[PDB]
Amino acid sequence: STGSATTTPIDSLDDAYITPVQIGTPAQTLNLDFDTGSSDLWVFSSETTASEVDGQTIYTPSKSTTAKLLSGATWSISYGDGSSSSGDVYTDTVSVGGLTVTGQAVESAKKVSSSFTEDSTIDGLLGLAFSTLNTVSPTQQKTFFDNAKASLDSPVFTADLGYHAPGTYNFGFIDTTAYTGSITYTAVSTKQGFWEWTSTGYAVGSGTFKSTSIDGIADTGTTLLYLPATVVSAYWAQVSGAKSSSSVGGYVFPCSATLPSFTFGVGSARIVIPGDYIDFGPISTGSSSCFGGIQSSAGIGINIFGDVALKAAFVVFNGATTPTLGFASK
Numbered sequence: 001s002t003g004s005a006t007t008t009p010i011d012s013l014d015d016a017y018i019t020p021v022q023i024g025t026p027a028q029t030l031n032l033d034f035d036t037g038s039s040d041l042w043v044f045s046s047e048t049t050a051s052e053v054d055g056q057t058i059y060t061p062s063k064s065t066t067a068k069l070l071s072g073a074t075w076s077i078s079y080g081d082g083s084s085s086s087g088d089v090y091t092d093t094v095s096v097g098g099l100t101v102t103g104q105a106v107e108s109a110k111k112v113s114s115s116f117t118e119d120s121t122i123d124g125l126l127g128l129a130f131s132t133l134n135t136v137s138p139t140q141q142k143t144f145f146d147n148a149k150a151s152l153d154s155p156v157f158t159a160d161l162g163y164h165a166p167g168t169y170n171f172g173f174i175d176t177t178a179y180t181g182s183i184t185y186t187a188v189s190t191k192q193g194f195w196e197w198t199s200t201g202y203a204v205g206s207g208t209f210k211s212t213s214i215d216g217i218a219d220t221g222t223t224l225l226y227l228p229a230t231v232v233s234a235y236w237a238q239v240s241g242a243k244s245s246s247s248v249g250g251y252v253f254p255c256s257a258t259l260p261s262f263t264f265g266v267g268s269a270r271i272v273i274p275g276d277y278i279d280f281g282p283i284s285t286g287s288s289s290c291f292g293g294i295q296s297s298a299g300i301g302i303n304i305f306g307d308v309a310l311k312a313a314f315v316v317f318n319g320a321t322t323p324t325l326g327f328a329s330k
């Protein structure tokens with residue numbers, strides 16, 4: 001089997017992407033944030049505290065003839081950005097782009113933090129990291145991809161995120177028309193539960209490529225590119241007037257600047273992020289200071305190849321016994 005679904009930016013900045021997901025019988029379609037940095041499929045629901053729902057579409061398990069309470073199971077998650085959610089668990093039928101999994105754990109939110117409430121466009125998350133990170137207790141649950149893997153034509157999914165445009169998530173096949181040149185497969189460590197890999201270096205604009213091992217995660221659920229402070233300083237030094245601000249909380253540059261590209265290495269291959277992808281526009285409405293798309297990871301503990309990086313590539317996630325990541329230009 002295979003599946004194919006369009007993923008759409010939630011706003012004009014590509015802050016996140018939503019993909020429609022069918023849950024239950026009859027189907028209830030919710031727009032979920034596919035997140036290769038986490039491993040829970042959780043949704044706003046009829047159980048979510050009413051004051052914490054503000055425009056999201058909710059899953060109502062009592063209206064699904066295939067829903068079953070997973071007795072005793074609870075979940076609770078905290079994300080790298082400080083947001084969080086928690087609740088109980090049902091199993092139900094879940095379909096993405098024509099690919100159906102029966103018995104998928106659907107984590108129903110009883111509580112969500114304010115950042116989720118305040119974002120009316122995201123109805124929940126669909127985690128695509130390794131199932132060892134799933135938070136369901138006392139019996140950890142499998143991700144949608146892990147449940148589908150055995151049925152797929154090939155045990156892979158691909159992320160093809162658009163710049164200011166829709167893109168595609170495919171399951172079970174590699175669309176050879178969706179990229180240019182060849183795909184580069186790099187080794188993955190699953191020791192932390194992430195799609196963790198090692199980049200062979202970087203360049204700023206037309207500058208020389210610096211060969212250096214940069215170990216990070218491929219994370220579709222993170223907006224920006226977070227890299228070591230040395231790398232980030234080298235990038236922003238090429239933008240007149242750019243500075244790191246303590247009050248704002250990262251690098252900012254004049255909104256009148258033209259940004260240089262940023263290249264990252266995947267083996268001997270190179271992925272080029274155009275300068276425009278690094279512009280996250282005014283810090284506040286009407287401001288002439290713009291917020292940068294490449295930021296320091298120094299306070300995170302891990303480097304993160306988020307959407308800024310991934311949208312410049314066609315990315316293959318391989319869930320076979322030897323995992324690997326693939327990157328192609330497009």
Ligand SMILES: CC(=O)N[C@H](CCc1ccccc1)C(=O)O
Pocket residue numbers: 184185186187188266267268322324
């Ligand atoms: C970029 C690079 O060095 N790739 C190699 C092979 C990556 C690989 C591993 C297994 C099967 C196919 C491909 C590596 O990371 O070890």
